[PDB]
Amino acid sequence: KPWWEDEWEVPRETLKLVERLGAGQFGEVWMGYYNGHTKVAVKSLKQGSMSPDAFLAEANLMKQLQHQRLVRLYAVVTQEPIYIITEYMENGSLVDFLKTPSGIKLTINKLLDMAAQIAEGMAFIEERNYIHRDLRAANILVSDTLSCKIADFGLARLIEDNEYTAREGAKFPIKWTAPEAINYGTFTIKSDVWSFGILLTEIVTHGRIPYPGMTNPEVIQNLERGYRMVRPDNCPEELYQLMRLCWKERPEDRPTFDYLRSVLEDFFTAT
Numbered sequence: 001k002p003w004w005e006d007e008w009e010v011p012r013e014t015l016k017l018v019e020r021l022g023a024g025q026f027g028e029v030w031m032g033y034y035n036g037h038t039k040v041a042v043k044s045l046k047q048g049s050m051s052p053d054a055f056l057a058e059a060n061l062m063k064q065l066q067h068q069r070l071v072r073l074y075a076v077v078t079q080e081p082i083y084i085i086t087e088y089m090e091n092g093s094l095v096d097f098l099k100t101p102s103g104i105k106l107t108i109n110k111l112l113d114m115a116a117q118i119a120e121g122m123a124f125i126e127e128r129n130y131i132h133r134d135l136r137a138a139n140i141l142v143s144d145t146l147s148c149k150i151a152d153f154g155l156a157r158l159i160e161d162n163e164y165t166a167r168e169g170a171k172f173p174i175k176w177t178a179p180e181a182i183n184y185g186t187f188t189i190k191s192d193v194w195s196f197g198i199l200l201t202e203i204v205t206h207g208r209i210p211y212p213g214m215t216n217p218e219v220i221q222n223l224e225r226g227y228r229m230v231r232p233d234n235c236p237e238e239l240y241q242l243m244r245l246c247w248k249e250r251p252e253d254r255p256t257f258d259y260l261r262s263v264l265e266d267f268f269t270a271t
């Protein structure tokens with residue numbers, strides 16, 4: 001749909017970039033203001049850094065997937081520099097936030113709450129026949145009321161039937177990624193479940209990197225032995241066992257995200 005005909009296209013002058021939140025090979029992310037009063041996040045493409053088509057593919061994706069638990073697309077400036085404008089999450093990244101004085105004082109009760117919120121947002125994605133493919137604490141954003149939303153859909157995909165096969169030449173975080181997606185390049189919603197498992201250790205340890213003390217090769221090597229990650233410290237055994245359902249060897253044995261949400265909400269309302 002043409003920009004002059006697009007409902008998401010906005011005049012670059014409606015925007016006011018105020019503070020850089022981060023800069024990368026491909027552009028920057030800013031906090032700014034839309035039409036004066038509304039705080040937004042803005043992500044701009046570095047001309048040259050990559051394809052405008054590739055950059056925008058993410059925003060187009062977010063036109064379809066909308067939900068209180070997913071970060072909301074606001075608008076695009078589809079002329080250079082190109083902008084993607086989203087709602088602004090005040091506490092930023094979950095992984096950063098958990099290391100703060102505030103997140104550090106977070107009770108296990110609240111942490112299980114946050115985890116049920118992330119599972120819930122993944123449930124919506126699940127039923128819409130999407131996979132995320134990059135699920136980990138870094139890609140979860142925290143609002144000023146301490147609620148959680150899934151972000152970053154650059155790698156997300158619709159699944160025509162069953163699964164997605166990656167190309168010969170794509171890499172993924174080895175520690176968050178399900179074996180089958182490492183070995184055969186095959187992704188399903190069920191390997192997002194694996195990642196949600198690593199994400200939970202990432203939560204209960206207030207941000208610590210999964211598989212402490214281990215290199216990627218060691219991790220791969222131990223998983224093939226049937227070993228899974230060692231119980232994180234101060235991890236309720238109820239919770240540790242849930243992570244283990246996520247790390248089932250056969251993909252189809254791993255639970256649904258709606259199941260996960262149910263269980264986590266039982267844990268939460270229990271404590």
Ligand SMILES: CCN(CC)CCOc1ccc(Nc2ncc3c(n2)N(C)C(=O)N(c2c(Cl)cccc2Cl)C3)cc1
Nearest residue numbers: 021029041042043084086087088089090091092151152
């Ligand atoms: C270095 C110091 N540090 C503070 C300690 C600064 C960082 O702290 C913050 C604070 C608040 C935010 N808030 C924030 N809200 C929404 C989005 C976002 N950040 N980022 C980084 C995106 O890439 N977005 C996004 C996405 Cl995921 C896709 C497409 C477009 C956008 Cl804007 C959505 C982010 C970071």
